[PDB]
Amino acid sequence: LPTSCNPSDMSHGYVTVKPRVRLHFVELGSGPAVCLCHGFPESWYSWRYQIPALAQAGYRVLAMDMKGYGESSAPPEIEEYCMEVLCKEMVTFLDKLGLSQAVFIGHDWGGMLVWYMALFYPERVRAVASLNTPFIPANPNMSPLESIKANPVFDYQLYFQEPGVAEAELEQNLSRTFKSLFRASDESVLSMHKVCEAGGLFVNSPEEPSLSRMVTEEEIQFYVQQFKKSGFRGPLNWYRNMERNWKWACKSLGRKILIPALMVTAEKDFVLVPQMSQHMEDWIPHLKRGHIEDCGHWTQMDKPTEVNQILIKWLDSDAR
Ligand SMILES: O=C(Cn1cc(C(=O)C(F)(F)F)c2cc(Br)ccc21)NC1CCCCCC1
Ligand SMILES: [Br-]
């Protein structure tokens, strides 16, 4: 396993992007700035195997707690978590750090964010990489509701819409929640396509799940402690701006991403399947790619060595 991170041995940074919205990050290394943006329901700590490796390779790594998470602010309002607001806040973050540009690397919702940053703020994005999450141009002729209903494996997203419902289930037993979620593909105890019918994520899953081979008890407990701070409302709110996000995205239609760009697919992510990325070169002509076999949704901790090799190869070449 690559070198990991001990939270108390990190530098912890805090930037107020607006009154009452303060973003926390950890920072390691010197060199060009690289900003890592996690997914749902994660942490800066999801990048624990990439932070040392990137620092060692000659980068200044800034691993965020995204808004809603960890030591970052978690306001309750849904519209605080639309992409337009989130991206503008990441630009403010760079401004207050005095960074003209950073490389942005995201996974999952953080992947979506970094695509949006590359599209709307290219002057601030030196290069962009996404793990698992593709870049799909908004289709102005289709409602987000339609699109989500048109894919069985997105059913959990409908469950996530009604405020309070998923929060209560996810918060009920945090250790159960993270042990249930953070599993390899072959260890999965959940089906994303059968959730609204069933009445929740964990209705058919073990009350006392085993520990995945991917994680230790201590690592699970870190996530538990982080999610006692603000719970899952802010995180889930990332999913509750589908119309607002689509309207914003439509404003960028026709624009091509011309900065250096990397798309990394994961063979065994059964929601963000590799084939979802198949047309991206239409919009990102000089896209580069990596592909990780035997890798599920939780890319960074499933295949940390492979992620590190892909990112470093790309950083040291196409991205410069
Ligand atoms: O919804 C997710 C994250 N996500 C949650 C999963 C769960 O098990 C949980 F219970 F937590 F909800 C989950 C499971 C797999 Br497999 C993959 C991804 C998962 N990401 C979206 C994907 C769609 C469009 C792009 C933006 C990001
Ligand atoms: Br999966």
Residue numbers in the entry: 228 to 547
Copied sentences from the primary study:
While the biological role of sEH-P still remains elusive, sEH-H was identified as part of the CYP epoxygenase branch of the arachidonic acid (AA) cascade. It catalyzes the hydrolysis of epoxy fatty acids, such as epoxyeicosatrienoic acids (EETs), to their corresponding vicinal diols. Thus, sEH-H plays a vital role in the catabolism of bioavailable epoxides, contributing to the detoxification of xenobiotics and regulation of signaling molecules. sEH-H is involved in a variety of disease-associated pathways, e.g., hypertension, diabetes, inflammation, and cancer progression. The active site of sEH-H consists of the catalytic triad Asp335-Asp496-His524 as well as the two stabilizing residues Tyr381 and Tyr465 opposite of the catalytic triad serving as an oxyanion hole.
Herein, we report the identification and characterization of epoxykynin, a potent inhibitor of the soluble epoxide hydrolase (sEH). Epoxykynin inhibited the hydrolase activity of purified sEH very potently with an IC50 value of 6.7 ± 3.2 nM. Additional analysis of inhibition of the phosphatase domain of sEH by means of an AttoPhos-based assay showed that the sEH-H and sEH-P inhibitor ebselen, but not the sEH-H inhibitors AR928150 and epoxykynin impeded the activity of sEH-P in this assay. These findings demonstrate that epoxykynin selectively inhibits the C-terminal hydrolase domain of sEH, but not the N-terminal phosphatase domain. The crystal structure revealed that epoxykynin binds to the catalytic center of sEH-H, occupying the binding site of the endogenous epoxide substrates. The ligand is stabilized by hydrogen bonds between the amide oxygen of epoxykynin and residues Tyr383 and Tyr466 and an additional hydrogen bond between the amide nitrogen of epoxykynin and Asp335 of the catalytic triad. The cocrystal structure elucidates general trends in the SAR of the epoxykynin derivatives. The N-alkyl amide binds to the catalytic triad of sEH-H, while the lipophilic cycloheptane occupies a deep hydrophobic pocket. The constraint indole ring creates distance to the small, electron-withdrawing bromo and trifluoroacetyl substituents. Besides the flexible C-terminus, there are minor structural deviations in a disordered loop of the cap domain of sEH-H between residues Ala411 and Lys421, indicating structural flexibility upon binding of different ligands. The two nitrogens of urea-derived sEH-H inhibitors act as hydrogen bond donors, while amide-based sEH-H inhibitors, such as epoxykynin, only contain a single nitrogen as potential hydrogen bond donor to Asp335 of the catalytic triad.
